[PDB]
Amino acid sequence: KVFGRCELAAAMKRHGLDNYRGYSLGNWVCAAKFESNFNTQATNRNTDGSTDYGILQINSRWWCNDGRTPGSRNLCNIPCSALLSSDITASVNCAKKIVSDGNGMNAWVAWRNRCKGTDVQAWIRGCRL
Ligand SMILES: [Cl-]
Ligand SMILES: [Cl-]
Ligand code: NA
Questions:
Q1: Which of 7, 18, 52, 66 is the catalytic position?
Q2: Is 7 a catalytic site residue?
Q3: Known catalytic residue: 35?
Q4: Which part of the chain is the C-type lysozyme domain?
Q5: Which ligand places an atom closest to the C-alpha of 107?
Q6: Domains of the chain, start order
């Protein structure tokens, strides 16, 4: 499923990302945009053999099991495919675990590179929340 920008902002809030660990909703929306273009089914192979999945491109090296990332962990205790669902519950929950891991959203390199330091409020501007 490919969400609309305001559609994704509302769902992320309903799912509690709003100011989670101090990250306002616009940070999350911004990250989702650049990681997956708002597409729950997005996947990309990393040069190390791991793969990123879903709207926030969560990695199989650490967070989910996809059965083909040797020596990896499954910290979110979920199969990576659950991160590709129209239902963003597993991606949201696993994202909360990641942002809580001590480096916050810097875990998302694309957030650090394209959102951090910018006016992220623009991502939820216009949206009824
Ligand atoms: Cl594996
Ligand atoms: Cl932080
Ligand atoms: Na894994």
A1: 52
A2: no
A3: yes
A4: 1-129
A5: 2
A6: 1-129 (1.10.530.10)
Count Cβ atoms below 10 Å from residue 67 Cβ, excluding itself: 10
What is the token pair recorded at 94? 């696993």
Q: In which residue are the tokens 């590179």 written? A: 113
| Closest to 91 (Cα-Cα) out of 72, 78, 73 | 78
74 Cβ contact list (under 8 Å, min separation 6) = 63, 64, 65
* DSSP-derived secondary structure letter, 39: B
Please tell me the experimental approach by which this structure was elucidated.
Answer: X-ray
Token reading at 60? 């199989």
Which two three-digit tokens encode residue 62? Answer: 């650490």
Resolution value (Å, 1 decimal)? 1.9
User: Residue 70's Cα: distance from chain center in Å?
Assistant: 23
3-state secondary structure of 118: coil
Which tokens in the block code for residue 59?
A: 């990695």
Hey, what amino acid is at 84? L
- Scanning the chain, the segments in alpha helix (DSSP H) are 5-14, 25-36, 89-99, 109-114
In angstroms, the Cα distances linking 54 to 2, 42, 89, 118, 126 are: 10, 5, 11, 24, 25
